Amino acid sequence: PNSMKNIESLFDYSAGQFEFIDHLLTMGVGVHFAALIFFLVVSQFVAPKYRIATALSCIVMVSAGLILNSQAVMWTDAYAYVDGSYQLQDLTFSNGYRYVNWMATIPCLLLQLLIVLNLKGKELFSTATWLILAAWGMIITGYVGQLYEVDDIAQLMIWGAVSTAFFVVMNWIVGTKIFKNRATMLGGTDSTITKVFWLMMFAWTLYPIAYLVPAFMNNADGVVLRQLLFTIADISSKVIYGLMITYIAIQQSAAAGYVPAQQALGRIG
Ligand SMILES: *C/C=C(C)/C=C/C=C(C)/C=C/C1=C(C)CCCC1(C)C
Ligand SMILES: CCCCCCCC/C=C\CCCCCCCC(=O)O
Ligand SMILES: [Cl-]
Ligand SMILES: [Cl-]
Known part of the structure; x- marks a missing residue:
């Protein structure tokens, strides 16, 4: 359906290129489901105020x-594999499914940051709302742009610019809330949370770069590079980010007097 609207459909692949993509995707599955079990086991050491932040990482692990x-x-x-190359047999592959999945996973990533920032009540609700709208704006427009990556690169770029406005505004909201709420953070996590900001600016920026591959490397190796970029970006934005979020949740939990958190950190010290 969208399969012919993505550059992957244009090319035959060497066994090397084809199998590397397969293995990237497969390693990413393994990493996410391994991290899943970690987040699961460690959730008992998070205080009730923050436990949802760790639960959201489990959800993101399984979703992604x-x-x-x-x-x-x-x-x-x-x-x-037909006559010495992987050749297209049917219209099953599209990057569109990622974009659709971001509609669920980006709001989960954002919500777990708000939780550990100690936002609650009306501020939590209003901040999550604006962020989810800005995120949906970005994803929807990017989803549309990406439908033109084969026959209209100008159109890909302009939907991209529009998506970028949304991204920039969401990042402004993120960063503002991070930098204004640092002082609420317990256990030294005022310092950790700024590294979370930077990680997000880094890892999330890789996705617009992947998006632009059809404009600067429209060949079978650009297809590989795009999957590689997604892979680096997924593990950074979801796994590494989630581990840092979970660290911050446990650390704040212990500083706030949650005994199972104290015992958990004490027995790795
Ligand atoms: C786990 C997935 C995450 C954190 C996905 C993040 C996706 C983005 C930050 C996407 C950004 C885009 C642009 C800013 C412009 C081009 C279109 C997008 C949607 C790729
Ligand atoms: C931060 C997450 C790290 C992502 C892990 C990616 C794992 C692979 C890393 C480098 C491999 C580079 C070698 C690729 C050879 C390409 C073969 C080919 O396409 O012909
Ligand atoms: Cl609590
Ligand atoms: Cl996802």
């Missing part, structure tokens, strides 16, 4: 892990 799994299966469904 399922899309990666699905991507790996669709990739192998779409191509068969």
Whole structure:
């Protein structure tokens, strides 16, 4: 459906290129589901005020892990090794599924940051609202732009610019709330949380770069690079980010007198 609107459909792949993509996607599944079990086990050491932040990482792990799994299966469904190359057999592969999944996962990532920032009540509700709207604005417009990556690069760029406005405004909201709420943070996490900001600015910026690959590297190796970029970006923005969020949740929990948190940190000290 969208499969012919993505540059992946244009090319035959060497076994090397094809299998590297398959393995990237598969390693990403393994990383997400491994991290899942960690987040799960460690949630008992998080105080009730913050426990939802760790639960949101579990949710993101399974959500992203399922899309990666699905991507790996669709990739192998779409191509068969015919006459010395992987050649397109049918219209099962599209990057569109990621974009659709971000509608759920980006709001989860954002919400767990707000939680550990100690926002509550009306401020939590209003901040999450504006952020989710700005995130949906960005994803929807990017989703549309990406439908033109084969036959209209100008259109890809302009939907991209529009998506970028949303991104920039969401980042402004994120950064403002981070920098204005640092002083509420317990246990030294005032310092940790600024590294979370930077990690997000880094990892999230990789996605617009992946998006632009059709404009600067429209060939089978740009297809590989795009998946590589997604892979680096997924693990950074979801796994590493989630581990830092969970660190911050446990650390604040212990500083606030939650005994299982204290015992957990004490027994790794
Ligand atoms: C786990 C997934 C995450 C954190 C996804 C993040 C996606 C973005 C920050 C996407 C950004 C885009 C632009 C700013 C412009 C081009 C279109 C997008 C949607 C790729
Ligand atoms: C921060 C997350 C790290 C992401 C892990 C990515 C793992 C692979 C890293 C480098 C491999 C580079 C070698 C690629 C050879 C390409 C083969 C080919 O395409 O012909
Ligand atoms: Cl609590
Ligand atoms: Cl996702």
